[PDB]
């Protein structure tokens, strides 16, 4: 009974990060030891004529980004573990995340390591216009 959510390629990384005390460090260390990035993300078919904003209610990818379903780019959602903020709630689940095409091979790692500019809504170092 039930419906599978995962593929065998993600078993090792997800099992490792599901048991870790510090899952974010565990995933960064997993990648540094040659591990493969988490796959089976929710990639969107979109026009690529979007605003380019980082976290949106609808896909907003521009010509230099891929849009993904937010929960699928969140290590804590992928591993079904606690979220690190005090309220234990997610900021990606329920939204779409725009990832630069250059970093689209690892959406989970990109969101773990990067920050959204609170002023212009673009990723810092990847489209954030202000200094």
């Amino acid at each position: 009974a039930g419906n599978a959510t995962e593929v065998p390629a993600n078993s090792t990384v997800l099992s490792f990060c599901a048991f870790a005390v510090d899952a974010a460090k565990a995933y960064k260390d997993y990648l540094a030891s040659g591990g493969q990035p988490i796959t089976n993300c929710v990639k969107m078919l979109c026009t690529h004529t979007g605003t380019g904003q980082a976290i949106t209610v609808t896909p907003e990818a521009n010509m230099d980004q891929e849009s993904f379903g937010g929960a699928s780019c969140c290590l804590y959602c992928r591993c079904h573990i606690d979220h690190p903020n005090p309220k234990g709630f997610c900021d990606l689940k329920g939204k779409y995340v725009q990832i630069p095409t250059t970093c689209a091979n690892d959406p989970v790692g990109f969101t773990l390591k990067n920050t959204v500019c609170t002023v212009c809504g673009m990723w810092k170092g990847y489209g954030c216009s202000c200094d």
Binding site: A1, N3, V7, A20, V21, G35, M44, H80, I81, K95
Partner: protein, 285 residues
């Protein structure tokens, strides 16, 4: 190809909205096209769902610098025979709001200890994963009719994991700087470990120079078996699966070939005693 790890056990026919699905596989069929997903304005997200996610199917074969491996070789387990603790879990089945996964019910150790837990699952919601009590039924049959009373005599997992840490600490502080869980068909025991085990790089005790075997979520600190009072997690445990040593029959038939003093009382601790007993006879004779 798919895995049973993180299998969605809800009875809901439809999949998830692209923003809420953890994976492409779990997105609802309506949004799927050309190997990708589409956003459909007018088909809203679900803000009330509770989806039981299965913890059956973990694979601890990671190779990461500085992180010790949980599963050890027979030769390394032999060297650490003082750290051996037989471990077995009798489970119950998810029911009513979910179907397709097993939850820990009675946890047995070769120390003779049996700990009864409240049936608890990892339930996905629109905001996070909720570690909460779930509806469960004891497995169908009469070899498990003793599990029926246990469905109402369980303890919350926050109490259960403190008790495991205390039992292991009192048993091992003068025997080893480690624990080696000795298992037979490790699958469900590894699933149950998700409930009380944390892993990471090797650390030292907060109060001494011995290696850390315990972790406390409340304080974000580590301790050896001597200073673990109040600790809730087993940190960096080791383990081995005796079934994988080429045995043909079941646990009791292989244990009974070498030992006649551990009769099968059909309880979690009995299986754990037999597992460790079998491992000793096979490894040292």
């Amino acid at each position: 190809n798919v895995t049973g790890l993180f299998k969605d056990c809800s009875k809901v026919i439809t999949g998830l909205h692209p923003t809420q699905a953890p994976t492409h596989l779990s997105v609802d069929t309506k949004f799927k096209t050309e190997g990708l997903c589409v956003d459909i304005p007018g088909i809203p997200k679900d803000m009330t769902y509770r989806r039981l996610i299965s913890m059956m199917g973990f694979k601890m074969n990671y190779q990461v610098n500085g992180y010790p491996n949980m599963f050890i070789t027979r030769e390394e387990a032999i060297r650490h025979v003082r750290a051996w603790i037989g471990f077995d879990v009798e489970g119950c089945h998810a029911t009513r709001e979910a179907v397709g996964t097993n939850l820990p019910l009675q946890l047995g150790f070769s120390t003779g200890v049996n700990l009864v837990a409240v049936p608890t699952g990892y339930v996905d919601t629109p905001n996070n994963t909720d570690f909460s009590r779930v509806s469960a039924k004891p497995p169908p049959g009469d070899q498990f009719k003793h599990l029926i009373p246990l469905m109402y005599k369980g303890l919350p997992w926050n109490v259960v994991r403190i008790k495991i840490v205390q039992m292991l600490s009192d048993t091992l502080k003068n025997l080893s700087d480690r624990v080696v869980f000795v298992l037979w068909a490790h699958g469900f025991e590894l699933t149950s470990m998700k409930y009380f085990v944390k892993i990471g790089p090797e650390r030292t005790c907060c109060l001494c120079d011995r290696r850390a075997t315990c972790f406390s979520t409340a304080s974000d600190t580590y301790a050896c078996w001597h200073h673990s009072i109040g600790f809730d997690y087993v940190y960096n445990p080791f383990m081995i699966d005796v079934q994988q040593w080429g045995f043909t029959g079941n646990l009791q038939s292989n244990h009974d070939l070498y030992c006649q003093v551990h009769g099968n009382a059909h309880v979690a601790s009995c299986d754990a005693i037999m597992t460790r007993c079998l491992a000793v006879h096979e490894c040292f004779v």
